[PDB]
Symmetry: D2
Subunit: 114 residues, 4 copies
């Protein structure tokens, strides 16, 4: 299945935060309605935050996360969870290698904000 693609409500502010846990430098691309609106880059084996931004979901509400290590696409896994019928998390794990820890870049999207 395609992973890392989420439909948010239109015109909604959301947070995106990425963490790194790999020898490789991670590149996290964030697309909103098919345009790149943020790129986070960094390297850590101890969960450093390599980027955190507030974005708007725009007209279509489509948010897509892509992860690469020097242009090689990582394998992704994702899901969305809703608490209290209101608080949303869109979650991505990624794997750059063969150990299948899926933490090499971890991306958390949250809404609503404010």
């Amino acid at each position: 299945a395609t992973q890392g693609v989420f439909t948010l409500p239109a015109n909604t502010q959301f947070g995106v935060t990425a963490f790194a846990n790999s020898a490789g430098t991670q590149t996290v691309n964030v697309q909103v309605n098919n345009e790149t609106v943020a790129t986070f880059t960094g390297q850590s084996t101890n969960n450093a935050i390599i980027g955190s931004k507030v974005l708007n979901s725009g007209g279509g509400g489509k948010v897509q996360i892509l992860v690469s290590v020097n242009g090689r696409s990582s394998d992704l896994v994702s899901a969305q969870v809703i608490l209290a019928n209101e608080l949303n998390f869109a979650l991505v794990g990624s794997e750059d290698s063969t150990d299948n820890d899926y933490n090499d870049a971890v991306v958390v999207i949250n809404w609503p904000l404010g």
Copy 2:
């Protein structure tokens, strides 16, 4: 039900990150096996990160999140999600008022690291 309480694997390094979305200054307490090991304090209405730390789960693996605003406990909601049978998120939302956005402090716990 009790919310904000999670069993991690024993003696395991994990990440904890807190975001704020409220007029009120948020105080986030992290307990590991019933002892306070970290406290985050901050204020934002735009999802600012008010703390991020790496901790060890200790003998029992018990991690509890508590959130208060000027000493008044917020109402919590939580769940744990596991992706690819490996990547774990323990998720907390909190509500300091009556609008029930449950984002007033948002806490994300992730493991494994490295």
Copy 3:
């Protein structure tokens, strides 16, 4: 927090299935936009299915699950999870006593259908 309340997409077919794991006979009330549309009653300590029905979320999309055992409301816990940005589960656990297994009646709501 209030639990067991979900906003589904409007006018959508959905499944609701209930499982029992308790000495006590479970009564599961399903409301759609604030009207009772199904009641499931049954007893099992081995996960028997005490009801499964197809319902429609109607104009407001509001779905609420309530559980009681011989006239006592059970304590609820709930969340919603979305896979492949499409497959939705709304999940309820309930507790009729003090052991906190939260499985005494388990309710699974799934959509889309067809």
Copy 4:
């Protein structure tokens, strides 16, 4: 990532239930520690339960779900969610065609029982 594979607690009773939503007859294979222990077959476009069983996770706790339609493997998506630090769901969607509703066979695994 491999999907539909879960590590349950070892030696634990669990429920497995499958629903069908497709023109195609679904075949759901349940393996426990690499051995087939249940097969559910059926056809519905209205969420009929095509099987529900109680199983034990055995020494390794490994549970794998596989889905095929007339011998062709469906594409799987899965996650595990935990409520109240106690109630577990392992969730599987599958897609037998190109519409990506991922509901063609839906499989719910729940524990603890009793």
